[PDB]
Every structure is written in C-alpha cells, then in structure tokens.
C-alpha cells in the first residue's frame, strides 16, 4: 500500500519565540493504523532554548491516528501527495503560537516541514521560565468546514508548582488532493516526553491517538 503498518518520518522546523530564533531536526517512527509513534528531536540552531519545550512538542503527525472503520481517514487518503495544516494556540496569559506545516511522502517515509512563531509570552510566565511539565490528555473535536478538516482543542499544560496552564487551539487540515472528508468526531491524544538531556537540546517524545464517534 501507500501507508504501511510501520512508517518512518523526518521533520524539519524553523521557528522563533519572543524573538529567539531556532531550528530543530528530528526523526521518528510509528504504527499509523495503531495510532502510536515516537520521535527524537535535536536543536540544531539557537540552542539551548530560553522557553519551555512543551509549546513545541505538539508540532512534531496525524497520519498516525487509529480510526474506526466507518470514519474516513482523511489524512491517510491524502497520500502519496500529502496535506498541510495551520495551527494557532491562544494561551490563557496572552501568548500566541502560530504554526504552518507541510506533509509529504518521499521514498516510503513521511517528510514534515514546520514553521513556528511564538509571541507575547510574559517574561515571568511559565513558558519563558520552563515551569511546565507536560501536556494532559486532550480531546480534539474534528469537523469538516469549507471543504477542509478542522479541529478545536481545549489543551491544558501541567505546571511544576502543581497548577495548570490552558490554551485554546484551532487547526485546519487540508489535503493537497481532493479526498473524502469525514463527519464530526473526536480524537483522543496523549503526548509524553520520554527522555531529554539537561538543557532540552535532545528530546524524545511518544504519542497515542485514537479516533471515535457515536
């Protein structure tokens, strides 16, 4: 087929948060039809980062989402061509993260290219001081709109002091070629940071995603 039961992927990122520019390269793998995947990111430029890694982790792959048989896998059918998506995360303290991404297939591996812009994070906020410690389990509400696939998340970050730190996320997924759009359904996601060095210049992640609907 086009999407084998085990697919690898490479990711390229250029971004800037509160003026500090950076670049990140990474490689990963996973089982697309099972909804599991891992990755190993490396800060190749601008490291170490003066902000929390947690705002970058959700930007490194919804081709690895376990879908029910009656829900069209819109982002799997988009291949071998691929798809693009845009994301805006509005954090509770005014911080805004802006993401664009291109997904393609080259020689049996997915190729990800990401561009990020973070802005208006308070200097004493949990982001610019790395007072965060991972994302909680999220539920993304998928729905078709304007010939594309859109999602809305009420994401929550854990704080080292025991509190939480929320963000409203909206994403629009559009296939490069016209394929079947699904109905309204939910996607349950859990993203974990499995390992990292001292200054978060080498980070590994793990994500489990599964779709469901009535």
């Amino acid at each position, epitope marked *: 087929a086009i999407i084998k039961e085990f697919m690898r992927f490479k990711v390229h990122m250029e971004g800037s948060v509160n003026g500090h520019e950076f670049e990140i390269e990474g490689e990963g793998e996973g089982r697309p039809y099972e909804g599991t995947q891992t990755a190993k990111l490396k800060v190749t430029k601008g490291g170490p980062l003066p902000f929390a890694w947690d705002i970058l982790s959700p930007q490194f792959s919804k081709a690895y989402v376990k879908h029910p048989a009656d829900i069209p896998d819109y982002l799997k059918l988009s291949f071998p061509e691929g798809f693009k998506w*845009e994301r805006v995360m509005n954090f509770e303290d005014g911080g805004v993260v802006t993401v664009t991404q291109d997904s393609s297939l080259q020689d049996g591996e997915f190729i990800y290219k990401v561009k990020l812009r973070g802005t208006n994070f308070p200097s004493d906020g949990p982001v610019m001081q790395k007072k965060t410690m991972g994302w909680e389990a999220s539920s993304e509400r998928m729905y078709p709109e304007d010939g594309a696939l859109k999602g809305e998340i009420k994401q929550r970050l854990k704080l080292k002091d025991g509190g939480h730190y929320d963000a409203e996320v909206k994403t629009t997924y559009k296939a490069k070629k016209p394929v079947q759009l699904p109905g309204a359904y939910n996607v349950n996601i859990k993203l974990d940071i499995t390992s990292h060095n001292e200054d978060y210049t080498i980070v590994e992640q793990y994500e489990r995603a599964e779709g469901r609907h009535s």
Partner: nanobody, 122 residues
Framework: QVQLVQSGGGLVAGGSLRLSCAASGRTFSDIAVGWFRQTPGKEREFVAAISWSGLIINYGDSVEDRFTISRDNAKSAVYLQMNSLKPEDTAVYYC??????????????????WGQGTQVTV
C-alpha cells in the same frame, strides 16, 4: 498561475475604505494574500497578510487595531478594511499572493504574484 485584480480604491480623515483583491487559477484555499504600500516611495512597507486557512493574520505596525484583513473562499477575494484612516496613510496599496503560507510576510520577493495598484488619498 494566480492572477490578481485590485478594487475598492478611492479617496477619504478617519474614514473607511474597503480594499479588495480577486484571484483566479489556483484554488483560493491554497493561496496566501499580502498587502504592501508606498506613498511617494519611502520604502514599500508591510500592511497586512492572511494565511490559506484564515487563522494566521500577521499585521504590520501602524495598521494595528486600525486596519483588519479578512478572506472569503466563496467569493475568492480578500478584503482590507481600513478604519480610522490617518493622513499619513495616503499611499498606493498593492495586493500580493503567496502559495504555501509565508513564515516571513514582509518579504515582497517571497510573494511571487503581484497585482496592479490602487491609490488611497486621505
């Protein structure tokens, strides 16, 4: 590919002027629009820009709060509502178009498709 034709130009202190720009060829859903302006020269500065999903609305400097950009994939056109027009905004405005969004939006050369030109005289 993408072709642009601007409209809505005219004359107006502290008024309203809806500038527009239509597109043909590539599907609007894959085209990112931009806006630049030059008064007698004095450097073509960045006005506003929108992404291909409408979620990313990078504005400029003086246009903060005053101006606003919006797109409609049904009519395949972008709109730059200019409100509270100050005399210093008297310039000729241009509409440019990219394809694949613009991490950097103030680079004119990164917008390959340009348009004609509409003059705003406050």
């Amino acid at each position: 590919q993408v072709q642009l034709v601007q409209s809505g130009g005219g004359l107006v202190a502290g008024g309203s002027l809806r500038l527009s720009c239509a597109a043909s060829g590539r599907t609007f859903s894959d085209i990112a629009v931009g806006w630049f302006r030059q008064t007698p020269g004095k450097e073509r500065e960045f006005v506003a820009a929108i992404s291909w999903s409408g979620l990313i609305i990078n504005y400029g400097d003086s246009v903060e709060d005053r101006f606003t950009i919006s797109r409609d994939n049904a009519k395949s056109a972008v709109y730059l509502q200019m409100n509270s027009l100050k005399p210093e905004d008297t310039a000729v405005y241009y509409c440019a178009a990219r394809i694949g969004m613009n991490y950097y939006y103030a680079r004119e050369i990164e917008y390959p498709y340009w348009g004609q030109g509409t003059q705003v005289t406050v």
